[PDB]
Amino acid sequence: FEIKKICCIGAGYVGGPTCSVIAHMCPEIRVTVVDVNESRINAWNSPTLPIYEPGLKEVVESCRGKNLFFSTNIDDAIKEADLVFISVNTPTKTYGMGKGRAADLKYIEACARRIVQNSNGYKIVTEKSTVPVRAAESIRRIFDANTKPNLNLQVLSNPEFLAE
Amino acid sequence: FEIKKICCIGAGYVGGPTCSVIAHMCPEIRVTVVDVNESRINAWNSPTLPIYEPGLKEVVESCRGKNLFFSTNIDDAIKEADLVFISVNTPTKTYGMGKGRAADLKYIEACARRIVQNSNGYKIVTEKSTVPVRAAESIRRIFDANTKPNLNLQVLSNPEFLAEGTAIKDLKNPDRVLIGGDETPEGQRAVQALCAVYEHWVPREKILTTNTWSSELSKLAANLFLAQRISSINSISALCEATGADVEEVATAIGMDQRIGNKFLKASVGFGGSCFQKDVLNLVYLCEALNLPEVARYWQQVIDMNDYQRRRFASRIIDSLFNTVTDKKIAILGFAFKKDTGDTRESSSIYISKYLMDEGAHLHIYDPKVPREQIVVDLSHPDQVSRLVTISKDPYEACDGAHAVVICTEWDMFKELDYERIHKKMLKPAFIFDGRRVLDGLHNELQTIGFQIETIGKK
Amino acid sequence: MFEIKKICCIGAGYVGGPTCSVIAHMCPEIRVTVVDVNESRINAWNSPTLPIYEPGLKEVVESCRGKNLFFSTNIDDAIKEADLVFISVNTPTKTYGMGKGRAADLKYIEACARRIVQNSNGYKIVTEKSTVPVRAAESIRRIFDANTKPNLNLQVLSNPEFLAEGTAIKDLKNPDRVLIGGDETPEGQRAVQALCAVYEHWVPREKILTTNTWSSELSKLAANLFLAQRISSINSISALCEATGADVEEVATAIGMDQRIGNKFLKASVGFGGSCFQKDVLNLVYLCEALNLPEVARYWQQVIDMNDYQRRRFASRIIDSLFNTVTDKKIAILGFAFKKDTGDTRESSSIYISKYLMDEGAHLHIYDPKVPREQIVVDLSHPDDQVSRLVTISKDPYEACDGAHAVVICTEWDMFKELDYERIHKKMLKPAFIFDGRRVLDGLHNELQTIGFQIETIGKK
Numbered sequence A: 001f002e003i004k005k006i007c008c009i010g011a012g013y014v015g016g017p018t019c020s021v022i023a024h025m026c027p028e029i030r031v032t033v034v035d036v037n038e039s040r041i042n043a044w045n046s047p048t049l050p051i052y053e054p055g056l057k058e059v060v061e062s063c064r065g066k067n068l069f070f071s072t073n074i075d076d077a078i079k080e081a082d083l084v085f086i087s088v089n090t091p092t093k094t095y096g097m098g099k100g101r102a103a104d105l106k107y108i109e110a111c112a113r114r115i116v117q118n119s120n121g122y123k124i125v126t127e128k129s130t131v132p133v134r135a136a137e138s139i140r141r142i143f144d145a146n147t148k149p150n151l152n153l154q155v156l157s158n159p160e161f162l163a164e
Numbered sequence B: 001f002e003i004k005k006i007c008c009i010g011a012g013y014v015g016g017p018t019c020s021v022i023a024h025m026c027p028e029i030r031v032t033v034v035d036v037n038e039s040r041i042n043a044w045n046s047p048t049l050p051i052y053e054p055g056l057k058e059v060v061e062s063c064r065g066k067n068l069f070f071s072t073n074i075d076d077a078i079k080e081a082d083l084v085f086i087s088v089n090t091p092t093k094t095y096g097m098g099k100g101r102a103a104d105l106k107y108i109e110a111c112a113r114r115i116v117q118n119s120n121g122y123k124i125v126t127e128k129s130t131v132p133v134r135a136a137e138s139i140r141r142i143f144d145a146n147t148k149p150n151l152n153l154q155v156l157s158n159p160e161f162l163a164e165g166t167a168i169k170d171l172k173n174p175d176r177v178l179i180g181g182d183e184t185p186e187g188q189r190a191v192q193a194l195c196a197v198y199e200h201w202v203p204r205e206k207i208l209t210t211n212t213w214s215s216e217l218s219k220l221a222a223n224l225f226l227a228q229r230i231s232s233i234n235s236i237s238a239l240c241e242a243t244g245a246d247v248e249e250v251a252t253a254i255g256m257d258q259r260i261g262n263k264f265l266k267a268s269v270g271f272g273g274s275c276f277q278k279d280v281l282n283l284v285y286l287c288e289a290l291n292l293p294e295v296a297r298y299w300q301q302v303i304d305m306n307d308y309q310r311r312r313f314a315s316r317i318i319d320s321l322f323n324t325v326t327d328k329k330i331a332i333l334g335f336a337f338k339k340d341t342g343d344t345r346e347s348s349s350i351y352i353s354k355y356l357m358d359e360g361a362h363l364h365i366y367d368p369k370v371p372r373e374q375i376v377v378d379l380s381h382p383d384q385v386s387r388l389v390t391i392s393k394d395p396y397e398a399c400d401g402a403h404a405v406v407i408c409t410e411w412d413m414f415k416e417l418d419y420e421r422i423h424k425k426m427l428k429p430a431f432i433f434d435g436r437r438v439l440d441g442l443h444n445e446l447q448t449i450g451f452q453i454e455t456i457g458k459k
Numbered sequence C: 001m002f003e004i005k006k007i008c009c010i011g012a013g014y015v016g017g018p019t020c021s022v023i024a025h026m027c028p029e030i031r032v033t034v035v036d037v038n039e040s041r042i043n044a045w046n047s048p049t050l051p052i053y054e055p056g057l058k059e060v061v062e063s064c065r066g067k068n069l070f071f072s073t074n075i076d077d078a079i080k081e082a083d084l085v086f087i088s089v090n091t092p093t094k095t096y097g098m099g100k101g102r103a104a105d106l107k108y109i110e111a112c113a114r115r116i117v118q119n120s121n122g123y124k125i126v127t128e129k130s131t132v133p134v135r136a137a138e139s140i141r142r143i144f145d146a147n148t149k150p151n152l153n154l155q156v157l158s159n160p161e162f163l164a165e166g167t168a169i170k171d172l173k174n175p176d177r178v179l180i181g182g183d184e185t186p187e188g189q190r191a192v193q194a195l196c197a198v199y200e201h202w203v204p205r206e207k208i209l210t211t212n213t214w215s216s217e218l219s220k221l222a223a224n225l226f227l228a229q230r231i232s233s234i235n236s237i238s239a240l241c242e243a244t245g246a247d248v249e250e251v252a253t254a255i256g257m258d259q260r261i262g263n264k265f266l267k268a269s270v271g272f273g274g275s276c277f278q279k280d281v282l283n284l285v286y287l288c289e290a291l292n293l294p295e296v297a298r299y300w301q302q303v304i305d306m307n308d309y310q311r312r313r314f315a316s317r318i319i320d321s322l323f324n325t326v327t328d329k330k331i332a333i334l335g336f337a338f339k340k341d342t343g344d345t346r347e348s349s350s351i352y353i354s355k356y357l358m359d360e361g362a363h364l365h366i367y368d369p370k371v372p373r374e375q376i377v378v379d380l381s382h383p384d385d386q387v388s389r390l391v392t393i394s395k396d397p398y399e400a401c402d403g404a405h406a407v408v409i410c411t412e413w414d415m416f417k418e419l420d421y422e423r424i425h426k427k428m429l430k431p432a433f434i435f436d437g438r439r440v441l442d443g444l445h446n447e448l449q450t451i452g453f454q455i456e457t458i459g460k461k
């Protein structure tokens, strides 16, 4: 199996620069970064990136429009991708059990369900973050319970060691 | 002296059914049930009774208008009665000394004063309730201080042992009748007259007589022994969940010991109802006045364990949903504290709901007999309810698009639901949290459908 | 699939002894051998005077001993020959180390398991039988799994014993239910059914419960808790009755008529004794520590705390009635066994009440119709100088009461209600006190008061 299309749910400090380098180093792979914040997505396609990272401006503009793309169309990007990165934020719970300490997995859970909603065939789903707290288990429990014919989703863990 | 006219102040779960069965068994006795709640009295005289009780409608309509009557005319009912029952509620004090533990005897004191105002001659005043906390004494203090010429009021204690949902069967065939009275010629005459009423359908060997205090203390102890059986088997259920056993199979081995008995050994989310928790709190407060801290902390554990059982069940629900429940639909099946009643007082369904509401869950509650207005008042503080709580018309609307189904009341209809239809419309993974062991024997079918079934005392 | 024709039981005590005697009496075609490391106890089983007092036990043993029932110190051979091996040894509480004073010491059960492996070839069924099975089956299975041999096939079953001392013969002949635990495998099913066939000689099939070994042990643990809790609950009520002017016996009658509660085990007392209940609560508490269940441990801990409180309150009432000074005062202690119709004194409330009185300097004169005199000395000498100065063992109740200030009844021996209390009162010092810790003198208070006694009983003013 060979990965030729990559989607990334989350265009923040992690998913943004990671996919920009992947697209820069893998020119034969189409890299599409998606995000729910349209203002952030527009900035990624603008001459003023939403985050300041030394050298990021040169890497993105070196392949944006060639094999690196930023879009708000989350559904179709997942539909075509062979590898789907999940690089969303997991805030700390503000109430309930674990208030102020436990992470809130509602965004990772929504990404897992939205992947099932727009996936057919074989796909590799990978969670990439700097603080992964039971993320792979949460994604796997959703995929095991929402199965389709000839639907084969794989769950990988690939933490990101980059420092801003 | 023959008791021929009975009046009962209080047309609730105790006084209402009790007087209906008395009038049913004693056709020659006029029984008048009075209450301050006019809408409740009107319901008693309507085809739709204010409380749901199996068989109560058939018993009421067989004698209502003949020798059973319901009225708001408290004064004349007292004046014409030979026997006066006091079956009102005593709420726990919300402030002052004993806040949250002590009972408030203002209603019983108010009844005793109103009885004196409308009484002449000889009457028998009998306190009848499930939690008689120093009731006969307080009635006696008022009568002894408000005397009229030729006014001779006798004070008796007659605790009611019925359980809601089975009140009719309990009243018709009680295990025993407990009557307390003074150890005087007058007290024994009063006690004997009350025994003659029960002898119309209760055998003599099942009628116990004692003094008023020993009567109330026996009732209180009996309630403690009952609640303790539930908390003990619930503590075993936590032990079963942690070690791989089934509390239902363990309760079977325990109950076959005839010294223990096989009753009241059903593990659950926690006991509820107006009797047991209050009874334990009154025991605790009583021991504070008597300086019996060792006795108080002994029985306090019955409440502490019941609260732990409730909290553990709610935590298993929250844990199964990735510790995040915000904007997740959850179905609550059953809101009464037990099946075959509409009463919600101290129901575990209230506490489980509040625990889920504090996590941001959108609750859809169904109960076949509990009215929707009662559920709203229970969940509302004396904002969250308007945002998170929906009252469903049928179980399949509450389970539509839900993450988990939570069974809190052992309604027999819940084991007859179309769970293939529920599973198709639920979000996956679909959880069933059986807090009453009602879906036992259906687990293999529920697992084949695709459910993640979690129950008490079993993994 | 397998039939038991020969039985060995390691442990010839209050559990193993009577149990095998009834089994041998009900199954004349099965050879039953009771073995024990204690030779003096084994010699007593083969004598006209049995080592334990149990009503009806003498008639059962003498009916089949020497025919199909045997007692011996030859543990190894008994094992070799046996189809089925019972393990009915004691498990004392650890006196040091992790779980000091709470956890069970499984060294004897482990030693039995290794001994079994040593003398076993082929197929045998090893069944653990005791009133307090604390993780016993798992410990035996772990030793068997690690010591395999060619053609060796040992099975491990759990079979808790529900008998109560004083009524063991009646309990064993007509049990409320038989509990047998075994692995949910073909091997375990064969072993369970084989043991069921033994009980089916006199126990109806509908009273034989089968499950796995852990659920079996957990059920026995829970059953003993419920029984002990009933005693502590009614004893908590006896404290309320004393403080408010009621009688616990009357309250207990009104409680017991509720068929959901039952009228058994509602007899208030000075406190429960015996080798099972206290031990069971402690084992549950320690088990909850390993399972991280402190709420469950806290809940059942109150059964012990209430029992210790009931004893202290009874001793305090005795000391209080004697001007809070009992130095050089003679006090009669009637009854030292933990219950009537037995000589067993394990955890008897009589020991605790005596030690509270000895701490006041009381001169105790103890009488019990079945407890041997040496056992009382050992019980009170447990860590004697204080026993030598204060303790006297009497041969009759009138000797123990001669010149005493108080009479303390700690055991419900029926003979205590037939004593000549006029003779006792004449030779007692005034005021003469009778402390009924068992309610055995109910109905006699009018007579005893007329004679001139001060009657103080549990659960009444």
Ligand SMILES: O=c1ccn([C@@H]2O[C@H](COP(=O)(O)OP(=O)(O)O[C@H]3OC[C@@H](O)[C@H](O)[C@H]3O)[C@@H](O)[C@H]2O)c(=O)[nH]1
Binding pocket: A009, A010, A011, A012, A013, A014, A015, A034, A035, A036, A037, A040, A087, A088, A089, A090, A091, A107, A108, A110, A111, A128, A129, A130, A131, A132
């Ligand atoms: O459901 C969601 C949630 C989040 N997102 C997007 O994910 C992006 C996250 O941006 P952030 O700058 O917060 O993310 P980061 O890349 O810095 O992640 C880092 O910080 C937050 C931690 O919880 C993460 O584990 C860490 O990797 C946002 O643009 C948000 O719109 C979605 O597109 N969908």
Ligand SMILES: O=c1ccn([C@@H]2O[C@H](COP(=O)(O)OP(=O)(O)O[C@H]3OC[C@@H](O)[C@H](O)[C@H]3O)[C@@H](O)[C@H]2O)c(=O)[nH]1
Binding pocket: A130, A160, A161, A162, A163, A164
């Ligand atoms: O010597 C130091 C280093 C760092 N710091 C402080 O520690 C904080 C973290 O600095 P980092 O450069 O590690 O910051 P980052 O959060 O970008 O990266 C960190 O989290 C994500 C992980 O993947 C990175 O490996 C980890 O370094 C900064 O506020 C920095 O000022 C010090 O105070 N002293």
Ligand SMILES: O=c1ccn([C@@H]2O[C@H](COP(=O)(O)OP(=O)(O)O[C@H]3OC[C@@H](O)[C@H](O)[C@H]3O)[C@@H](O)[C@H]2O)c(=O)[nH]1
Binding pocket: B009, B010, B011, B012, B013, B014, B015, B034, B035, B036, B037, B040, B087, B088, B089, B090, B091, B107, B110, B111, B128, B129, B130, B131, B132, B274, B275
């Ligand atoms: O002053 C008063 C107070 C109360 N009442 C009536 O007494 C009735 C009490 O009925 P409830 O259903 O509340 O009470 P129950 O019959 O269930 O009693 C039970 O629960 C409450 C406990 O405090 C009681 O001790 C117990 O018996 C109410 O209808 C109330 O209107 C009066 O008529 N006058």
Ligand SMILES: O=c1ccn([C@@H]2O[C@H](COP(=O)(O)OP(=O)(O)O[C@H]3OC[C@@H](O)[C@H](O)[C@H]3O)[C@@H](O)[C@H]2O)c(=O)[nH]1
Binding pocket: B130, B160, B161, B162, B163, B164, B165, B223, B226, B230, B263, B264, B265, B266, B267, B268, B269, B270, B271, B272, B273, B274, B275, B276, B337, B338
């Ligand atoms: O085995 C059981 C029994 C009961 N329960 C729970 O305990 C609560 C009380 O149930 P009960 O049937 O005792 O109901 P009630 O409260 O109506 O009656 C109780 O209080 C009044 C007394 O006079 C009755 O004798 C007593 O049973 C219910 O929530 C029930 O679900 C269990 O969880 N398990």
Ligand SMILES: O=c1ccn([C@@H]2O[C@H](COP(=O)(O)OP(=O)(O)O[C@H]3OC[C@@H](O)[C@H](O)[C@H]3O)[C@@H](O)[C@H]2O)c(=O)[nH]1
Binding pocket: C010, C011, C012, C013, C014, C015, C016, C035, C036, C037, C038, C041, C088, C089, C090, C091, C092, C108, C111, C112, C129, C130, C131, C132, C133, C275, C276
């Ligand atoms: O290694 C050993 C240990 C013990 N034994 C024997 O096992 C017998 C134990 O009998 P006991 O009378 O002490 O005990 P019981 O039969 O009353 O058992 C009861 O009390 C003690 C608890 O730990 C047991 O779990 C309970 O069943 C003793 O006779 C002892 O000699 C052995 O033969 N070998």
Ligand SMILES: O=c1ccn([C@@H]2O[C@H](COP(=O)(O)OP(=O)(O)O[C@H]3OC[C@@H](O)[C@H](O)[C@H]3O)[C@@H](O)[C@H]2O)c(=O)[nH]1
Binding pocket: C131, C161, C162, C163, C164, C165, C166, C224, C227, C231, C264, C265, C266, C267, C268, C269, C270, C271, C272, C273, C274, C275, C276, C277, C338, C339
């Ligand atoms: O109503 C009662 C019953 C019992 N007790 C006391 O509780 C203690 C235990 O009495 P039991 O008759 O239960 O005696 P045992 O210890 O022999 O049996 C107990 O432990 C072993 C288990 O197998 C038995 O099922 C259990 O009853 C005695 O000291 C007895 O006096 C009371 O104080 N009141």
Ligand SMILES: [Cl-]
Binding pocket: B357, B358, B359, B360
């Ligand atoms: Cl909220």
Ligand SMILES: [Cl-]
Binding pocket: C358, C359, C360, C361, C386
């Ligand atoms: Cl001393």
